[PDB]
Amino acid sequence: QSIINPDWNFEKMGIGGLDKEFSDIFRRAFASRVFPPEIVEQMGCKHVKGILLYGPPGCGKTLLARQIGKMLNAREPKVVNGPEILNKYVGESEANIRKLFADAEEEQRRLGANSGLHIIIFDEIDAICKQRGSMAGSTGVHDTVVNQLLSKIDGVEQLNNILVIGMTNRPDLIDEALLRPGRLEVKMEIGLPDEKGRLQILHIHTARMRGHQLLSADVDIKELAVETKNFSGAELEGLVRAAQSTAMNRHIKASTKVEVDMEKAESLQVTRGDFLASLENDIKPAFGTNQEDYASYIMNGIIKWGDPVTRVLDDGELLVQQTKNSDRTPLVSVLLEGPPHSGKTALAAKIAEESNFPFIKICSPDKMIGFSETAKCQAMKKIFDDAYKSQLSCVVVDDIERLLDYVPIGPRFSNLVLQALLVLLKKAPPQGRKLLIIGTTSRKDVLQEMEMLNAFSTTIHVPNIATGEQLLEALELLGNFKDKERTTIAQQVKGKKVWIGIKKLLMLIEMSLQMDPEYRVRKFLALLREEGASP
Amino acid sequence: QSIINPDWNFEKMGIGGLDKEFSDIFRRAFASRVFPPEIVEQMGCKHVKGILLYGPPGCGKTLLARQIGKMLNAREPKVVNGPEILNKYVGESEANIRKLFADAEEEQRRLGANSGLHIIIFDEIDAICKQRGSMAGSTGVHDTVVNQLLSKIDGVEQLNNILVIGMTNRPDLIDEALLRPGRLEVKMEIGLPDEKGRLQILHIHTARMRGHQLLSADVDIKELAVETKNFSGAELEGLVRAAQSTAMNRHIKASTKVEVDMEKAESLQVTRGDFLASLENDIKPAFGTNQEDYASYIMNGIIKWGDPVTRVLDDGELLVQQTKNSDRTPLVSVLLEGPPHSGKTALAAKIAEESNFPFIKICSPDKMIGFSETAKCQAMKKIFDDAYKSQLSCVVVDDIERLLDYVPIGPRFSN
């Protein structure tokens, strides 16, 4: 009798994005039990009796366990939901644990080799199994529980008909004696899917609607797969659920009483607008940098008032390509420098957005107001570790002079943060992985004095508005003043050199607009005169 | 049997100022339970099992949860008041968690997909559901309860007949695995109302008085709605209660013996003087403002002794206008400077008072005597955090040189 149900199919279990992991598990676990017995006996090997799954929330471990339980032809599995074993009386947790292995021992002692398989599932296993000698209170029962489990899985008596599965979110808190070969051999990590896995999941979760003709013809799954970046399977299912709810709500009226049409409920369709609306207002991922960040960091967009705006972007593109391709320099660095109010943060964010790497992050001082030195170092270290775990990553560090608390009087600054930055600027990730670092500053001489300017690979300059033609082009691209007023302005600016930042010009224009319609250009020109210059 | 009660009406709930939130909750949580079952079966979609409400104190979270519980044709809900499950014996505080789900499991296993709905309410949820430490030697006091709850809400055995509701004031301390789209998928903020909501609440709380001709006719609700800026739903009810108490007290004499003139109690009516007296002496808001602080900072008035005063006031008015009417520049700042004893703080206070914004606050060193720099940073951050919860705000920073602890010798200051 085979251990696999006759009516089993891999497409029946409805898991997408985990083909490789399932292949590895099947090879390492069930290969011996399906192969003919005589040759296996001639080999003289024992079977595997342990699996451990770990990963972040919402990625599909319990689904794997349930489907594996349904796949095999054996008794109904035993499942332990968290810390169900604990009891108030002495010797009663260990008895609860010993009750889980009785039938396996009985059948092994009776039928010997020709016996069926017994499955046990441990959910939230980190609650009951932790390193021995780490709890200050109530450890007396915990260590005894761990010892009983260890003695039961692998002891003087030998069993050959048990399989144990565990799932956890905190793999580093588990006892090491439990993870050695012979007890829990196959360790698997479940992580976020890529675009093809997302497409597979999105196809899985719409098959019935497509079959029953309840899905509109303007919905394109590939666009959704491209659009839903950083999502997990649970979020991908929630998005579809939200779209279905939005579609349903158009046939229910609830003002005084609740009523359903029941005539237009037939001919229900799910359109693309429902999907778009949900993506905007309902579901938001919990990983990486999303639209809410780019909205804040680039508030008024990017306008091409001159030539350097394209030069900066071209240099950024070249650096990104170099990071992507080169293999002898996995780590690259660059510094954006210029006078104040020039727009360095927005350009850095734009370049990072155009990079299109899987991992992007922004480290800014406005998220750590009031922190001490140690907290800042810890935050930076955590962000860089998260960057390291990926394959190809990008990181942005803006307002360096604010990250280290610099004041000209003194001077005064934080040495700990400076040393941490200097160490991090020259550390490479694990082999086969690549990282790009972008930095912004407004005081280059101070960084030169501290000997940080030699830890960067290159630098890029970001200039100000220098001539009246560029000023008039910017005014044209903003559309604040009409042609009649712009003629008067050109009568004054073209015969002079200007020195103004992009961020200051918007403030000047909004201050000028408050005057009456007669005194607008006059106030604008007075403020521009007050600005002065210092190239 | 329909899930909704046959006699339910939206207007009987008694909730004013939160139409959009209720619409969203109804669409996301109850739409699939009211639609015909055959079509829902053709879609292969599960029901939502979780809701979270968060916001500042006094805005209507417990009332909303109670009304939701009352509107459904189901069993009597289960209520958990704070840390009511904690016990001292080992393994006993998790059996309490497991006991909350027994009937749902039994009825599921018995009746399949024809079972009813089971509601569970968690009040002060953050008391028992903080983040797990996830570091050796830094394990939390009770992470077994969190594990049990996580395993019970979403586990190997599947339930489709439960709904969980929670309420909190500190949403940033909850565990991350509890808030994912499979456990508590709908998350809503309950904040301060605007003028329309204030008018609705006042109508709700004055309808019964108006029914029995117990309310005078010099009373205008639309005037009260304008006069009460940045009030919560509880403060308006307190104001009405105080006005009623003032009206009632006029017919009682206390001293030797308590006696009620049960002849004039028939011609009892609540007037516009009671409301005015209450606004002045009884109720003081939290995100609003009162006139005493201005009297503290503008002590001897302001007199026009020359031209500069008018110039300063006009300059302030123009920046108030720009900050109110500008979209490209949501943030603007200005600095007032001059020689000592020239009267700049009073001018700043006058400009802030004349802005007419709903939220106005003053940050002063007079309230930070003996503080360390960490405490000063925390206080400033707290002041600035309250202002982000308003549509229009103005903040005044006084005596910047005293805030930094500057002395010319050395010099010395707080970086």
Partner: peptide, 16 residues
Amino acid sequence: MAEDADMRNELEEMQR
């Protein structure tokens, strides 16, 4: 100083 935290208990049974 900080006051020692709260602690759990174990129990023992007796026959008659």
